[PDB]
PDB file of all heavy atoms in Angstrom:
ATOM      1  N   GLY A   1       0.818  -1.199   0.000  1.00 22.73           N
ATOM      2  CA  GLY A   1       0.000   0.000   0.000  1.00 22.73           C
ATOM      3  C   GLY A   1       0.854   1.252   0.000  1.00 22.73           C
ATOM      4  O   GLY A   1       0.505   2.274  -0.615  1.00 22.73           O
ATOM      5  N   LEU A   2       1.993   1.171   0.697  1.00 26.02           N
ATOM      6  CA  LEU A   2       2.925   2.294   0.691  1.00 26.02           C
ATOM      7  C   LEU A   2       3.460   2.564  -0.712  1.00 26.02           C
ATOM      8  O   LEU A   2       3.636   3.729  -1.097  1.00 26.02           O
ATOM      9  CB  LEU A   2       4.069   2.029   1.670  1.00 26.02           C
ATOM     10  CG  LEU A   2       4.952   3.215   2.061  1.00 26.02           C
ATOM     11  CD1 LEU A   2       4.102   4.409   2.456  1.00 26.02           C
ATOM     12  CD2 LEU A   2       5.878   2.827   3.198  1.00 26.02           C
ATOM     13  N   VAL A   3       3.695   1.507  -1.496  1.00 22.75           N
ATOM     14  CA  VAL A   3       4.157   1.699  -2.869  1.00 22.75           C
ATOM     15  C   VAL A   3       3.087   2.377  -3.725  1.00 22.75           C
ATOM     16  O   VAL A   3       3.410   3.203  -4.589  1.00 22.75           O
ATOM     17  CB  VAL A   3       4.633   0.357  -3.467  1.00 22.75           C
ATOM     18  CG1 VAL A   3       3.480  -0.625  -3.651  1.00 22.75           C
ATOM     19  CG2 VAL A   3       5.351   0.590  -4.787  1.00 22.75           C
ATOM     20  N   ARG A   4       1.806   2.076  -3.489  1.00 20.88           N
ATOM     21  CA  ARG A   4       0.740   2.737  -4.237  1.00 20.88           C
ATOM     22  C   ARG A   4       0.655   4.216  -3.885  1.00 20.88           C
ATOM     23  O   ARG A   4       0.445   5.064  -4.766  1.00 20.88           O
ATOM     24  CB  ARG A   4      -0.595   2.048  -3.967  1.00 20.88           C
ATOM     25  CG  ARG A   4      -1.744   2.593  -4.793  1.00 20.88           C
ATOM     26  CD  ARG A   4      -3.038   1.877  -4.465  1.00 20.88           C
ATOM     27  NE  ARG A   4      -3.058   0.513  -4.978  1.00 20.88           N
ATOM     28  CZ  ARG A   4      -3.857  -0.442  -4.524  1.00 20.88           C
ATOM     29  NH1 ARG A   4      -4.710  -0.219  -3.539  1.00 20.88           N
ATOM     30  NH2 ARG A   4      -3.799  -1.652  -5.073  1.00 20.88           N
ATOM     31  N   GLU A   5       0.807   4.543  -2.598  1.00 17.94           N
ATOM     32  CA  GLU A   5       0.816   5.948  -2.197  1.00 17.94           C
ATOM     33  C   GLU A   5       1.978   6.697  -2.844  1.00 17.94           C
ATOM     34  O   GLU A   5       1.818   7.832  -3.320  1.00 17.94           O
ATOM     35  CB  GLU A   5       0.877   6.064  -0.675  1.00 17.94           C
ATOM     36  CG  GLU A   5      -0.479   5.971  -0.001  1.00 17.94           C
ATOM     37  CD  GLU A   5      -1.364   7.164  -0.308  1.00 17.94           C
ATOM     38  OE1 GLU A   5      -0.830   8.285  -0.447  1.00 17.94           O
ATOM     39  OE2 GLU A   5      -2.595   6.981  -0.410  1.00 17.94           O
ATOM     40  N   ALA A   6       3.157   6.067  -2.881  1.00 18.06           N
ATOM     41  CA  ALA A   6       4.306   6.686  -3.539  1.00 18.06           C
ATOM     42  C   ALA A   6       4.051   6.889  -5.028  1.00 18.06           C
ATOM     43  O   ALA A   6       4.423   7.925  -5.594  1.00 18.06           O
ATOM     44  CB  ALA A   6       5.558   5.838  -3.322  1.00 18.06           C
ATOM     45  N   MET A   7       3.416   5.908  -5.676  1.00 17.13           N
ATOM     46  CA  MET A   7       3.107   6.025  -7.098  1.00 17.13           C
ATOM     47  C   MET A   7       2.156   7.185  -7.370  1.00 17.13           C
ATOM     48  O   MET A   7       2.331   7.923  -8.346  1.00 17.13           O
ATOM     49  CB  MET A   7       2.513   4.713  -7.609  1.00 17.13           C
ATOM     50  CG  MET A   7       2.066   4.749  -9.060  1.00 17.13           C
ATOM     51  SD  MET A   7       1.331   3.191  -9.590  1.00 17.13           S
ATOM     52  CE  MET A   7      -0.074   3.091  -8.483  1.00 17.13           C
ATOM     53  N   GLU A   8       1.139   7.356  -6.521  1.00 14.66           N
ATOM     54  CA  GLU A   8       0.209   8.472  -6.696  1.00 14.66           C
ATOM     55  C   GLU A   8       0.908   9.816  -6.501  1.00 14.66           C
ATOM     56  O   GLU A   8       0.702  10.761  -7.281  1.00 14.66           O
ATOM     57  CB  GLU A   8      -0.965   8.334  -5.727  1.00 14.66           C
ATOM     58  CG  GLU A   8      -1.993   9.449  -5.844  1.00 14.66           C
ATOM     59  CD  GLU A   8      -3.031   9.410  -4.739  1.00 14.66           C
ATOM     60  OE1 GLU A   8      -3.711   8.373  -4.597  1.00 14.66           O
ATOM     61  OE2 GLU A   8      -3.170  10.419  -4.016  1.00 14.66           O
ATOM     62  N   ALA A   9       1.741   9.919  -5.461  1.00 13.84           N
ATOM     63  CA  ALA A   9       2.429  11.179  -5.193  1.00 13.84           C
ATOM     64  C   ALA A   9       3.402  11.531  -6.314  1.00 13.84           C
ATOM     65  O   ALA A   9       3.573  12.711  -6.652  1.00 13.84           O
ATOM     66  CB  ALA A   9       3.152  11.103  -3.850  1.00 13.84           C
ATOM     67  N   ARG A  10       4.034  10.515  -6.912  1.00 13.81           N
ATOM     68  CA  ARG A  10       4.983  10.755  -7.995  1.00 13.81           C
ATOM     69  C   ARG A  10       4.319  11.398  -9.206  1.00 13.81           C
ATOM     70  O   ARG A  10       4.896  12.304  -9.818  1.00 13.81           O
ATOM     71  CB  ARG A  10       5.656   9.443  -8.400  1.00 13.81           C
ATOM     72  CG  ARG A  10       6.711   9.592  -9.481  1.00 13.81           C
ATOM     73  CD  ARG A  10       7.767  10.611  -9.089  1.00 13.81           C
ATOM     74  NE  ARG A  10       8.580  10.151  -7.970  1.00 13.81           N
ATOM     75  CZ  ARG A  10       9.614  10.816  -7.473  1.00 13.81           C
ATOM     76  NH1 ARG A  10       9.983  11.987  -7.965  1.00 13.81           N
ATOM     77  NH2 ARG A  10      10.296  10.292  -6.459  1.00 13.81           N
ATOM     78  N   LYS A  11       3.117  10.954  -9.570  1.00 11.34           N
ATOM     79  CA  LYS A  11       2.439  11.547 -10.714  1.00 11.34           C
ATOM     80  C   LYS A  11       1.736  12.853 -10.372  1.00 11.34           C
ATOM     81  O   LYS A  11       1.495  13.664 -11.274  1.00 11.34           O
ATOM     82  CB  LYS A  11       1.436  10.563 -11.324  1.00 11.34           C
ATOM     83  CG  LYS A  11       0.291  10.167 -10.416  1.00 11.34           C
ATOM     84  CD  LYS A  11      -0.635   9.187 -11.115  1.00 11.34           C
ATOM     85  CE  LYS A  11       0.099   7.916 -11.507  1.00 11.34           C
ATOM     86  NZ  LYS A  11      -0.800   6.953 -12.196  1.00 11.34           N
ATOM     87  N   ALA A  12       1.390  13.081  -9.100  1.00 11.70           N
ATOM     88  CA  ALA A  12       0.929  14.417  -8.721  1.00 11.70           C
ATOM     89  C   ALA A  12       2.049  15.447  -8.842  1.00 11.70           C
ATOM     90  O   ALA A  12       1.824  16.574  -9.324  1.00 11.70           O
ATOM     91  CB  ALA A  12       0.372  14.399  -7.298  1.00 11.70           C
ATOM     92  N   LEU A  13       3.263  15.072  -8.423  1.00 14.13           N
ATOM     93  CA  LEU A  13       4.399  15.981  -8.518  1.00 14.13           C
ATOM     94  C   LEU A  13       4.725  16.337  -9.963  1.00 14.13           C
ATOM     95  O   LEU A  13       5.228  17.433 -10.224  1.00 14.13           O
ATOM     96  CB  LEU A  13       5.623  15.369  -7.841  1.00 14.13           C
ATOM     97  CG  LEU A  13       6.769  16.342  -7.564  1.00 14.13           C
ATOM     98  CD1 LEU A  13       6.496  17.135  -6.301  1.00 14.13           C
ATOM     99  CD2 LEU A  13       8.090  15.601  -7.472  1.00 14.13           C
ATOM    100  N   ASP A  14       4.441  15.437 -10.909  1.00 15.34           N
ATOM    101  CA  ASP A  14       4.693  15.729 -12.318  1.00 15.34           C
ATOM    102  C   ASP A  14       3.855  16.908 -12.799  1.00 15.34           C
ATOM    103  O   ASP A  14       4.375  17.844 -13.419  1.00 15.34           O
ATOM    104  CB  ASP A  14       4.409  14.490 -13.167  1.00 15.34           C
ATOM    105  CG  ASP A  14       4.655  14.726 -14.644  1.00 15.34           C
ATOM    106  OD1 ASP A  14       5.748  15.217 -14.996  1.00 15.34           O
ATOM    107  OD2 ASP A  14       3.751  14.428 -15.453  1.00 15.34           O
ATOM    108  N   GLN A  15       2.551  16.880 -12.512  1.00 17.19           N
ATOM    109  CA  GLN A  15       1.673  17.976 -12.909  1.00 17.19           C
ATOM    110  C   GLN A  15       2.043  19.264 -12.183  1.00 17.19           C
ATOM    111  O   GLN A  15       2.040  20.352 -12.781  1.00 17.19           O
ATOM    112  CB  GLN A  15       0.215  17.600 -12.643  1.00 17.19           C
ATOM    113  CG  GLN A  15      -0.759  18.761 -12.743  1.00 17.19           C
ATOM    114  CD  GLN A  15      -2.187  18.305 -12.960  1.00 17.19           C
ATOM    115  OE1 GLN A  15      -2.488  17.114 -12.887  1.00 17.19           O
ATOM    116  NE2 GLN A  15      -3.076  19.254 -13.231  1.00 17.19           N
ATOM    117  N   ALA A  16       2.370  19.159 -10.887  1.00 18.73           N
ATOM    118  CA  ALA A  16       2.774  20.351 -10.142  1.00 18.73           C
ATOM    119  C   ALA A  16       4.024  20.986 -10.746  1.00 18.73           C
ATOM    120  O   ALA A  16       4.074  22.207 -10.956  1.00 18.73           O
ATOM    121  CB  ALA A  16       3.004  20.003  -8.673  1.00 18.73           C
ATOM    122  N   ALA A  17       5.026  20.164 -11.070  1.00 18.70           N
ATOM    123  CA  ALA A  17       6.254  20.663 -11.677  1.00 18.70           C
ATOM    124  C   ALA A  17       5.985  21.279 -13.042  1.00 18.70           C
ATOM    125  O   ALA A  17       6.546  22.325 -13.383  1.00 18.70           O
ATOM    126  CB  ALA A  17       7.271  19.530 -11.798  1.00 18.70           C
ATOM    127  N   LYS A  18       5.132  20.633 -13.843  1.00 18.26           N
ATOM    128  CA  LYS A  18       4.860  21.129 -15.188  1.00 18.26           C
ATOM    129  C   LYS A  18       4.189  22.495 -15.150  1.00 18.26           C
ATOM    130  O   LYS A  18       4.590  23.416 -15.878  1.00 18.26           O
ATOM    131  CB  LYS A  18       3.991  20.124 -15.943  1.00 18.26           C
ATOM    132  CG  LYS A  18       4.162  20.152 -17.453  1.00 18.26           C
ATOM    133  CD  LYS A  18       3.358  19.044 -18.124  1.00 18.26           C
ATOM    134  CE  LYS A  18       3.439  17.733 -17.348  1.00 18.26           C
ATOM    135  NZ  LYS A  18       2.854  16.594 -18.106  1.00 18.26           N
ATOM    136  N   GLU A  19       3.182  22.660 -14.290  1.00 19.40           N
ATOM    137  CA  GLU A  19       2.506  23.948 -14.246  1.00 19.40           C
ATOM    138  C   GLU A  19       3.295  24.996 -13.471  1.00 19.40           C
ATOM    139  O   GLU A  19       2.983  26.187 -13.580  1.00 19.40           O
ATOM    140  CB  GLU A  19       1.099  23.801 -13.663  1.00 19.40           C
ATOM    141  CG  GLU A  19       1.013  23.864 -12.155  1.00 19.40           C
ATOM    142  CD  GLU A  19      -0.409  23.688 -11.662  1.00 19.40           C
ATOM    143  OE1 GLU A  19      -1.088  22.746 -12.123  1.00 19.40           O
ATOM    144  OE2 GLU A  19      -0.854  24.500 -10.827  1.00 19.40           O
ATOM    145  N   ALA A  20       4.307  24.594 -12.696  1.00 19.31           N
ATOM    146  CA  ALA A  20       5.244  25.580 -12.165  1.00 19.31           C
ATOM    147  C   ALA A  20       6.201  26.063 -13.250  1.00 19.31           C
ATOM    148  O   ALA A  20       6.484  27.266 -13.360  1.00 19.31           O
ATOM    149  CB  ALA A  20       6.016  24.991 -10.984  1.00 19.31           C
ATOM    150  N   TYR A  21       6.705  25.133 -14.067  1.00 21.88           N
ATOM    151  CA  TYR A  21       7.667  25.490 -15.105  1.00 21.88           C
ATOM    152  C   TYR A  21       7.022  26.342 -16.188  1.00 21.88           C
ATOM    153  O   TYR A  21       7.663  27.247 -16.736  1.00 21.88           O
ATOM    154  CB  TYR A  21       8.286  24.232 -15.720  1.00 21.88           C
ATOM    155  CG  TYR A  21       9.039  23.351 -14.746  1.00 21.88           C
ATOM    156  CD1 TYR A  21       9.238  22.004 -15.018  1.00 21.88           C
ATOM    157  CD2 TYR A  21       9.550  23.862 -13.559  1.00 21.88           C
ATOM    158  CE1 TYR A  21       9.922  21.189 -14.134  1.00 21.88           C
ATOM    159  CE2 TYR A  21      10.235  23.055 -12.669  1.00 21.88           C
ATOM    160  CZ  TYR A  21      10.419  21.720 -12.963  1.00 21.88           C
ATOM    161  OH  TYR A  21      11.100  20.912 -12.082  1.00 21.88           O
ATOM    162  N   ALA A  22       5.758  26.062 -16.518  1.00 21.44           N
ATOM    163  CA  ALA A  22       5.057  26.868 -17.515  1.00 21.44           C
ATOM    164  C   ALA A  22       4.938  28.320 -17.061  1.00 21.44           C
ATOM    165  O   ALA A  22       5.211  29.254 -17.828  1.00 21.44           O
ATOM    166  CB  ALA A  22       3.676  26.271 -17.793  1.00 21.44           C
ATOM    167  N   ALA A  23       4.547  28.523 -15.799  1.00 23.32           N
ATOM    168  CA  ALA A  23       4.438  29.873 -15.256  1.00 23.32           C
ATOM    169  C   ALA A  23       5.792  30.566 -15.186  1.00 23.32           C
ATOM    170  O   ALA A  23       5.889  31.761 -15.490  1.00 23.32           O
ATOM    171  CB  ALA A  23       3.789  29.832 -13.873  1.00 23.32           C
ATOM    172  N   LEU A  24       6.844  29.839 -14.793  1.00 27.86           N
ATOM    173  CA  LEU A  24       8.177  30.438 -14.754  1.00 27.86           C
ATOM    174  C   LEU A  24       8.639  30.862 -16.144  1.00 27.86           C
ATOM    175  O   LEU A  24       9.201  31.952 -16.316  1.00 27.86           O
ATOM    176  CB  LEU A  24       9.174  29.463 -14.129  1.00 27.86           C
ATOM    177  CG  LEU A  24      10.645  29.886 -14.153  1.00 27.86           C
ATOM    178  CD1 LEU A  24      10.866  31.133 -13.312  1.00 27.86           C
ATOM    179  CD2 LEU A  24      11.537  28.752 -13.675  1.00 27.86           C
ATOM    180  N   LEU A  25       8.396  30.020 -17.153  1.00 27.34           N
ATOM    181  CA  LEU A  25       8.799  30.359 -18.514  1.00 27.34           C
ATOM    182  C   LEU A  25       8.016  31.554 -19.047  1.00 27.34           C
ATOM    183  O   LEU A  25       8.588  32.426 -19.712  1.00 27.34           O
ATOM    184  CB  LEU A  25       8.624  29.148 -19.430  1.00 27.34           C
ATOM    185  CG  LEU A  25       9.139  29.307 -20.863  1.00 27.34           C
ATOM    186  CD1 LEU A  25      10.618  29.662 -20.865  1.00 27.34           C
ATOM    187  CD2 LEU A  25       8.888  28.042 -21.667  1.00 27.34           C
ATOM    188  N   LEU A  26       6.710  31.616 -18.764  1.00 27.83           N
ATOM    189  CA  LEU A  26       5.922  32.761 -19.218  1.00 27.83           C
ATOM    190  C   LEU A  26       6.345  34.046 -18.514  1.00 27.83           C
ATOM    191  O   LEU A  26       6.357  35.120 -19.129  1.00 27.83           O
ATOM    192  CB  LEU A  26       4.431  32.498 -19.011  1.00 27.83           C
ATOM    193  CG  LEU A  26       3.810  31.419 -19.901  1.00 27.83           C
ATOM    194  CD1 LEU A  26       2.292  31.467 -19.823  1.00 27.83           C
ATOM    195  CD2 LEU A  26       4.278  31.569 -21.341  1.00 27.83           C
ATOM    196  N   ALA A  27       6.690  33.957 -17.225  1.00 27.27           N
ATOM    197  CA  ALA A  27       7.181  35.126 -16.502  1.00 27.27           C
ATOM    198  C   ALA A  27       8.515  35.600 -17.065  1.00 27.27           C
ATOM    199  O   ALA A  27       8.773  36.806 -17.148  1.00 27.27           O
ATOM    200  CB  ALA A  27       7.305  34.806 -15.012  1.00 27.27           C
ATOM    201  N   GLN A  28       9.387  34.658 -17.438  1.00 27.16           N
ATOM    202  CA  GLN A  28      10.644  35.033 -18.080  1.00 27.16           C
ATOM    203  C   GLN A  28      10.410  35.663 -19.448  1.00 27.16           C
ATOM    204  O   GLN A  28      11.101  36.619 -19.818  1.00 27.16           O
ATOM    205  CB  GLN A  28      11.558  33.812 -18.205  1.00 27.16           C
ATOM    206  CG  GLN A  28      12.936  34.112 -18.790  1.00 27.16           C
ATOM    207  CD  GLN A  28      13.035  33.787 -20.273  1.00 27.16           C
ATOM    208  OE1 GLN A  28      13.033  32.620 -20.666  1.00 27.16           O
ATOM    209  NE2 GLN A  28      13.127  34.821 -21.101  1.00 27.16           N
ATOM    210  N   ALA A  29       9.442  35.147 -20.209  1.00 27.34           N
ATOM    211  CA  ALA A  29       9.236  35.620 -21.574  1.00 27.34           C
ATOM    212  C   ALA A  29       8.552  36.983 -21.607  1.00 27.34           C
ATOM    213  O   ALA A  29       9.122  37.956 -22.111  1.00 27.34           O
ATOM    214  CB  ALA A  29       8.423  34.594 -22.366  1.00 27.34           C
TER     215      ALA A  29
END
């Protein structure tokens, strides 16, 4: 069950990172 929780958190972090990087790039541009 701990591995499933880690798997869910890993893919949540992907979306969080992507929408952070998009905002950073737009702020730079």
Side-chain angles (χ1 to χ4, degrees):
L2 195 48
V3 67
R4 185 181 288 160
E5 275 292 326
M7 176 182 62
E8 180 189 303
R10 183 55 68 176
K11 63 180 60 180
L13 194 81
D14 180 51
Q15 168 160 8
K18 207 175 319 190
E19 86 181 48
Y21 300 157
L24 174 64
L25 186 58
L26 291 193
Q28 183 261 290

